Amino acid sequence: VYSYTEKKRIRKDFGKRPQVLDVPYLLSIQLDSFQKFIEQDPEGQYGLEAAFRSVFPIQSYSGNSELQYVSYRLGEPVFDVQECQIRGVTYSAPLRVKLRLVIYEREAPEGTVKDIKEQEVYMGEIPLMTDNGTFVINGTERVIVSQLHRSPGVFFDSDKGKTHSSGKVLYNARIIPYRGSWLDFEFDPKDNLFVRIDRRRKLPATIILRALNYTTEQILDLFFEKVIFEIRDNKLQMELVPERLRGETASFDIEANGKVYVEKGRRITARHIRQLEKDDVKLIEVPVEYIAGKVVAKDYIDESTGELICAANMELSLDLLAKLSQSGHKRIETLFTNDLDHGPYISETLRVDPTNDRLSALVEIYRMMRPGEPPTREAAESLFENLFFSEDRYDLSAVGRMKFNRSLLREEIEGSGILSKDDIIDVMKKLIDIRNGKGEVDDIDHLGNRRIRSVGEMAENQFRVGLVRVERAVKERLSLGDLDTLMPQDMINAKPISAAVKEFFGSSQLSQFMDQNNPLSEITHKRRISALGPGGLTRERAGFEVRDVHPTHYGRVCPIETPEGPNIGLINSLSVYAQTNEYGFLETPYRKVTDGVVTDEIHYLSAIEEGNYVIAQANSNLDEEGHFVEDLVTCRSKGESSLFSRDQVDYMDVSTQQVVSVGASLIPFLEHDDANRALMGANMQRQAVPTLRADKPLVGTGMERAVAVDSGVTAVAKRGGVVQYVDASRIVIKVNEDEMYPGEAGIDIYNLTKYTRSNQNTCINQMPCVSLGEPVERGDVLADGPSTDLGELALGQNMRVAFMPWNGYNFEDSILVSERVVQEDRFTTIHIQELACVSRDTKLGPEEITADIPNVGEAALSKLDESGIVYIGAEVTGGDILVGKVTPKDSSLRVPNGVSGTVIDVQVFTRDGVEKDKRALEIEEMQLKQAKKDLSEELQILEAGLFSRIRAVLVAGGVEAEKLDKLPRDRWLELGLTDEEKQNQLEQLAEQYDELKHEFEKKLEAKRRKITQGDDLAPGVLKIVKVYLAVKRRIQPGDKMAGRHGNKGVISKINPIEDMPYDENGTPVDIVLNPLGVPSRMNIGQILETHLGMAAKGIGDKINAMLKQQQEVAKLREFIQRAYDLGADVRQKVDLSTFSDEEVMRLAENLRKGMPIATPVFDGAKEAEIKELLKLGDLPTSGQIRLYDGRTGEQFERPVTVGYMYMLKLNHLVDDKMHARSTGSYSLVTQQPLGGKAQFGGQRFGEMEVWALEAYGAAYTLQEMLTVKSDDVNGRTKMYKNIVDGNHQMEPGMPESFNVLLKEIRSLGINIELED
Amino acid sequence: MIKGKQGRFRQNLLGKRVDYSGRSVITVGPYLRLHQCGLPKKMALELFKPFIYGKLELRGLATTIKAAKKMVEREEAVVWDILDEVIREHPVLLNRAPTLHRLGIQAFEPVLIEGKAIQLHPLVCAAYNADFDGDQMAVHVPLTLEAQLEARALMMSTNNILSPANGEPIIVPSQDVVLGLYYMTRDCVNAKGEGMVLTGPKEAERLYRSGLASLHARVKVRITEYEKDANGELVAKTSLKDTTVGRAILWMIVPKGLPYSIVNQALGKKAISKMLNTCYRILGLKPTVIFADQIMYTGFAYAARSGASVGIDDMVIPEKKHEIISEAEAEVAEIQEQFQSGLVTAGERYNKVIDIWAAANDRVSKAMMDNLQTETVINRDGQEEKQVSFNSIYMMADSGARGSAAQIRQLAGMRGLMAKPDGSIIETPITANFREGLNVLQYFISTHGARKGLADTALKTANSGYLTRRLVDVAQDLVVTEDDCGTHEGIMMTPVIEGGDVKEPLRDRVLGRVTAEDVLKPGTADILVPRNTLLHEQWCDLLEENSVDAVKVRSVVSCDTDFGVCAHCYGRDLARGHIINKGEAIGVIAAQSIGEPGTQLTMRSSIQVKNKGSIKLSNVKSVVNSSGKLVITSRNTELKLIDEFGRTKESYKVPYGAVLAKGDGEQVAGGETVANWDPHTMPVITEVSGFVRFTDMIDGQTITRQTDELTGLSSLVV
RNA sequence: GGAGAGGUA
Ligand SMILES: [Mg+2]
Ligand SMILES: [Zn+2]
């Protein structure tokens, strides 16, 4: 059940919940989105194919010809990854598309072909994606984070009464397309209805209604019920709808069927309607006074005169009734109006409308959209048409249509990408309906309304907006005549597309530099989910409602991991199990709960579908049958939590740890800390500098191996086999027999990247973790990268910590560090810096790098060879010469002050047309030799593998072991053999061997060509020389090392070992933290971790003692078994009886430094098992032992706490911060000292400090500090003279910056000057 | 190029960059005196370079500036002694980045250190608000002579002890020395060597160090106090006190003139602050600073000896927590059942649930605290007794080092009710402390709360910065610029009352402000103070014993000087014990003092007299009603409860038409309900008896005959 | 010199 390579170190595991869904690949959302971006998708709906088929074909205006698209293709990358990183050129791929120009015949009818021509036009360079998921742009590999932008569709939002100061809400409805112009409807405080387009001036909506060719009566018939009045012999017997009487009173006596149904002044009861319907009344005689305040429905005309008695949509008057009766209009249609059921919100807008016909409405729209430019008959209609209904300028995506139809209770989840009359009408209907009470506003933080937009989609859209320009250019080109000699090369230009894509990839707000000082930093940076960028919300003007955690975040976006400071809640990180839906929403997994059984089938649910069901959370006890042992089970029904019955549930979470991000899943005992302190813990875990030799963490959360192998650093095997020859640089695996293809036998070979700089100057290299003869299996780990150990993440070191105040040296948060921590050299970190030197081509001729420079003794030149470049391996120090350059008339590069280290690599590039000096030729020859030797070695490795395969297949059916060795290998592959498929295999292998020979003999030539060629370079440079320094930053008082629970601190002293507290056994502790920091900053996780680590190291020490004296396996087997036992029904169940009796010995060997312990975040080890484990060793169960002071030698009372804690050394050194300046450079426009450490700049005496100095009586110091120390040029020259001459004084003068202000303000018309 | 932060005015014209500067990280180094700070060798040799050149040329070791620059560049061993020679008495300025108040930038002497981090004395961290978790500080050097003298005589750290905002000391021993002292001045009921007698402090010290007596055990020891109650003459008086060897050892540190009872209690944080304040107010300045340094040293030493560590067994969960929570659960269930049957409404169910959960939370907190603070039961050489507990967490919390009782409640008892984002309170509290584990949902809710807190701090500080910048730009031009304006108008300073107790007494509102019109003792015509004297502590005592009530005090809002205020009108400097010096910028310090705390703020029946005393009414226009009580017909009627002395002690607002049991000048029993009224509806109260005639009261067009229907009496509505 | 991104207090 346990792999061989997994028996090196079995991590004792706590926890009780049986995992049911192992963590997925942690980089899916990148390697899959970009995978879909570039693929042959015949369905034509993903990636480039969609864009091409969307913009093409292109039809000319006449149109006598058109240009249509056929297919595309991606060429071979010019340079592989390593060369691109070395030189600084994008790891790109040419893009070749097979356009096709077709020419019709003018005289012949529309549709005919005179001749059609096509060719493969080049256009663009799309960067590719490395295996890990990081692009390389200019030797500065970057990563693109995903965006979280609000989805296209429709939203009925509202303002919470923050306008008009009347406490009256104002609902509004917005239609957001995926690409085009928006649309808004709003309610004025006077219950009007205003359209608004792209946030321009307001408009009454009725005009946009008329734009679709609608008449007044049409609108009214669309938006209202009609009450009918019947002019009869007796004053308007009226046809009544029963539902009207609901919620209204009677102004008269409703009496019909010879029965007084109700009198006036009485509110109408449901009983009244019930009796009316029982009597089945259809008509009621109504007094004429009721029609006093009504409004006609449709216009009514006089039959004889042909005139209009009363236009539609106007009130009624008694004389109007008289005219109606005179005209004999029997049926009169009027509006159905009420103050709560059917507000007449349309008629009022009609009245506000100053327009009546289609032309005038279109003209109004045209004038609003384009101020000035008097409209024409066609301009307005063309504007409207191509604004809102042309597929080329307005487009709801498929997601848009789906969301839209889901928000209007439709049935179809697919339709057109444009609007239509019914869409706008339905939106207006729904908005009015909301105003009347039915329906509900929609909040905006719902994760069912925000869409993840990964790298593929954004790049595709940038490519499309690139294509639009060339489309316009070619359309206007074809509009011209003279098409008899065109080709699809001159009209298509490669510059626009390349610019449009390159600018996005290289300089955007979402393609950012990838911090690379860990495996964890990379993994947690590729999963980032930003909300800023184009189309998102600005950093500094974002409200507060956005930053909070919505209840829908549970299981999709981690709630505790977020960069604090200026932007909280905008850079939230993705959760562990969260997937991306088909459209782009965020899904999370759940376990289907049938009638009463918790099954194992899992469904991925979206943010909206969760709001309906009932989900019982993860830690609900069940016993071997899916039956919930308890009967009142906790659940999250819909945006809230409760307790429900054992049968009402419908889903149960997957695992306890699907709520947290990957970054915060490594904290042990996470459930005990506070929230913000765990937040700081994670954000500081992301910055741990890799150390000199990594060490496993004694107390992990079992989520290490996944992060280690799912990042790219470790060299994970691909086909299990047997190690054939390991080495400090490469590895070779003979593949097992099963996992081998029929032909192309070969053997797997791995190359390991030795010391090469990361992006933060921390060296990354790989070390083998196997030896000869060791079997390995698919997916196993072979080469450990930076901060890894047998393939499990290990960022810092585990050290012995004691909690107690110590002579104030750990006063606030400081840390007292024993001297063993530096004597054993277990925190020193290696840094690699790159220093460049260029030979510009300037006036007075160019300058060179000759080894001779003026006025310097040979001593400083001892380290430069005859050419002028330092030797590889020289041990430079602060203030030295690396390359000697000359002032053309001394610009030699020099080591930055304060840094030490050794030069480990030199490179030189020379522009074509310049002869190459001696050193460059030497390096080129060295590289030639190295490449040839490497290729020869690998070739013979593969050849030996092939012949081993052949010998394997020959001995089957006709073995002559003696014969094979007699005739050498060179003549084996034609020996006789019986007739069967075996001969076929022999032929195939021989063919493979010849092919391999050819492959090598040409690849060598390719590498020679790549090396010996010239180098592209920027204009003006002749040659660039780069030198790499390696430094060992060891440790100083001032560094900043921190734990995993946000207990950062600045190391404060390095005590000699004889002064540190030591327990009665004699082992002095190695840290002394400050106990005062726990209670106020509630994080007990560190204390519990300390106790657990103490127990683990106790067990390790017992095993180490047992092995020191020779103890046979009889005892180690027993003890290790009993140790792996002693849980509270744990799920580990590791059985030692099955081990090979020598893997037991090796397991003991790897456990002698402590038994690793696991603790899933929210299902961890409680107190009782910690106590039991402690008692397994002979340690005191209380957890606190009695120490002894170092100096006095007397005992501390109050027994203190000592244990083992995992600590990281953060990347905030002291020697990158400490800085000083006395008299350096000076800015140009305003004479003030420069700023920053790069330049030798000085600090800033900010405004608030000036206030502070004024608060004292201090006046002289302030005056000098902003007159003679920074600005007044003559003042400071004389100050320097005086100081040198030992006579302290000053000559103030006037600041230069003030003169700058004076001139600048005088540059306007203002005349400002100084008076007498 | 002029507007905005990037414009000249706010970028290159008000605050410039500056030469002769440096920046680094800070560490503690608690071996420093109060008036010096560490300085790395490299920064020292780079900042002071011109002075090194000057000394080298004076001494003739380099006859030019190029040779001297070479010698400095490769630092022949000679330059180090020269550098030490230059540093001897040359102060530097240390500054932190967000420097809010005047104490943010302070002078120091430098002491060279073979490191790369600026060592900072641990007492001033409170003034800087500088944790040691990576804060960076900047160093400047003053060049000219007047700048050096200004640094030494205005900003040297031993001259800023009292905060300008208020007289309170600002170098209070902060968080660890306080724990050490508190653990030092205690007493176990039965420790080693209890009951013997000693011949003075040093004898006790020797006894403890030899290990024959524990650090705290009751013991009689003879002590010689000093009292300078005479005219500046110290008088020694000996006695035989009964204290604990810890306190006797501590007494060896304090200066001469302080009563022994000042180091006899448990010495929390507040006690140490008060001790420093009294020492300063009795013995000038220099003894206070040296005493503070010695306090820090002894505190650190004995805290280290204590070995006060924190463990997981020192978080005791009260044994009744489960029963309390189960009973509360059943109580919730019964109300849930009630509302299931419709007997109650949703709002009342919700409110009752919240109330009973609050009651359960309070009961759990109380039970935990009671089982925590006194669990120690130890025999007193007889049978049994109990004392204040030594549980580490309690010892840290009570002393005042770190964390109030709220954090202890969250660590041991249930952690209250958590609020969802939109201000609502979740009906289901978190019933799990941190010693036990929070499950998923509880942690989710706590996460929301924490994120709200973080975002609020960010926005709040962002806004407070703008507030202070506005304030300092309206008062920047004001400078006390005379000696005495010569006026008589002031304001009436009185203790503040809110309806309940005194939120602020009189003695803390006129401490250090000159009088306007001489007060007359309540022996009226007895002039107690002159009219233009500074009300320092002694006069404050005289006011207190005579129970003065309201004082006319000259205030800076009415001073008649033009283009500035006069010395007397302002008062006492409040940052050093004497009247304000002529020619001082006060507007800026006032603005900064108001703006500094701006980040610690938050962004979003019947009268029951509770003290025996006479009752007085102000602005009474009343009559006697039918019940013999007093019915008021005026709005500004206010009632003051005055003690037997004749000094007001309580105040209450009397609504119009409120009935009062008493009249005027009676005596009220404590807890007596003295008045009542109908705050809901307003009456048409009349003044005298008689018939009431509805004049111009006509049904139909002026009023409505809305006759009462449930009873049937006469009713008509205007 | 100016922009954009990330980070620390
Ligand atoms: Mg800090
Ligand atoms: Zn005055």
Side-chain angles (χ1 to χ4, degrees), chain B residues 485 554 559-560 566 569:
Chain B
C485 64
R554 288 164 63 181
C559 185
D560 288 9
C566 83
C569 271

Side-chain angles (χ1 to χ4, degrees), chain A residues 813 1048, chain B residues 96 129-136:
Chain A
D813 282 344
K1048 54 193 161 189
Chain B
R96 189 163 178 268
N129 177 22
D131 56 2
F132 290 86
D133 64 7
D135 289 7
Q136 304 183 21

Side-chain angles (χ1 to χ4, degrees), chain A residues 811, chain B residues 26 28 32-37 94 96 101 103-104 106-108 119-132 137 156-158 160 170-174 296:
Chain A
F811 177 83
Chain B
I26 54 177
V28 176
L32 314 166
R33 275 199 177 192
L34 180 53
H35 72 89
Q36 53 183 353
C37 73
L94 291 178
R96 189 163 178 268
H101 54 292
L103 306 169
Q106 288 191 49
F108 284 114
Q119 290 198 340
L120 184 61
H121 193 283
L123 276 185
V124 301
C125 309
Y128 280 100
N129 177 22
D131 56 2
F132 290 86
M137 294 188 68
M156 192 72 112
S157 187
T158 71
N160 298 345
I170 203 64
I171 54 183
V172 289
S174 304
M296 180 185 70

Side-chain angles (χ1 to χ4, degrees), chain B residues 100-388:
Chain B
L100 276 299
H101 54 292
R102 183 184 77 173
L103 306 169
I105 182 177
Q106 288 191 49
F108 284 114
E109 288 199 20
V111 171
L112 268 52
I113 290 302
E114 289 101 16
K116 284 193 172 180
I118 293 174
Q119 290 198 340
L120 184 61
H121 193 283
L123 276 185
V124 301
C125 309
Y128 280 100
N129 177 22
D131 56 2
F132 290 86
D133 64 7
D135 289 7
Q136 304 183 21
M137 294 188 68
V139 163
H140 305 275
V141 292
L143 297 175
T144 194
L145 207 56
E146 297 94 358
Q148 296 177 12
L149 265 168
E150 269 204 358
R152 185 172 305 284
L154 295 174
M155 296 178 295
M156 192 72 112
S157 187
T158 71
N159 291 7
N160 298 345
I161 297 185
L162 306 189
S163 168
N166 50 8
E168 305 291 320
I170 203 64
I171 54 183
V172 289
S174 304
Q175 81 179 39
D176 188 352
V177 50
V178 58
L179 169 57
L181 291 197
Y182 175 77
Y183 167 80
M184 208 169 69
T185 74
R186 280 285 292 275
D187 56 352
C188 272
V189 73
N190 172 20
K192 186 177 182 184
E194 173 185 11
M196 63 179 64
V197 61
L198 313 178
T199 85
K202 57 183 70 60
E203 175 65 359
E205 177 185 15
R206 182 178 70 187
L207 195 66
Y208 161 58
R209 283 305 215 159
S210 41
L212 310 186
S214 181
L215 190 55
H216 35 74
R218 291 152 184 173
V219 161
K220 297 186 186 305
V221 64
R222 70 186 310 181
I223 300 180
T224 68
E225 311 181 355
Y226 279 83
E227 192 59 20
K228 55 157 57 180
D229 198 317
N231 60 313
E233 296 295 352
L234 283 293
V235 174
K237 54 180 293 304
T238 176
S239 183
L240 196 75
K241 309 283 166 41
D242 52 2
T243 56
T244 183
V245 303
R247 301 171 212 173
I249 279 177
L250 182 52
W251 171 262
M252 189 173 57
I253 201 180
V254 306
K256 281 290 178 190
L258 277 79
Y260 179 72
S261 177
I262 204 176
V263 302
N264 215 359
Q265 59 267 4
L267 276 182
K269 182 191 185 69
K270 195 67 61 54
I272 294 172
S273 180
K274 186 183 73 177
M275 179 206 299
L276 279 178
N277 206 333
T278 56
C279 172
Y280 178 77
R281 285 308 200 285
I282 290 184
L283 294 189
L285 181 72
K286 306 179 295 305
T288 287
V289 56
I290 183 59
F291 173 64
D293 178 7
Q294 293 297 330
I295 283 297
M296 180 185 70
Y297 288 178
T298 44
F300 282 149
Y302 285 104
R305 193 72 47 67
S306 184
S309 178
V310 58
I312 201 62
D313 308 322
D314 297 3
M315 316 181 91
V316 290
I317 292 179
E319 205 168 0
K320 296 300 300 184
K321 165 165 168 290
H322 199 61
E323 302 306 336
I324 294 169
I325 292 178
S326 60
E327 282 190 11
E329 178 58 62
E331 209 69 2
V332 170
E334 85 173 358
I335 304 304
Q336 174 52 220
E337 177 54 54
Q338 278 192 19
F339 183 73
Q340 283 166 210
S341 57
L343 266 57
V344 293
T345 179
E348 297 307 319
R349 183 202 63 85
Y350 175 83
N351 287 325
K352 288 188 176 181
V353 163
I354 282 176
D355 185 308
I356 63 185
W357 272 119
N361 170 30
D362 168 63
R363 282 174 60 192
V364 170
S365 170
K366 168 183 159 299
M368 172 272 283
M369 202 69 192
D370 285 357
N371 184 22
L372 173 54
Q373 68 166 336
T374 58
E375 61 166 356
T376 44
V377 291
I378 58 182
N379 49 16
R380 83 305 186 290
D381 88 350
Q383 49 280 2
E384 190 274 3
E385 204 171 5
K386 50 174 59 180
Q387 68 194 20
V388 181

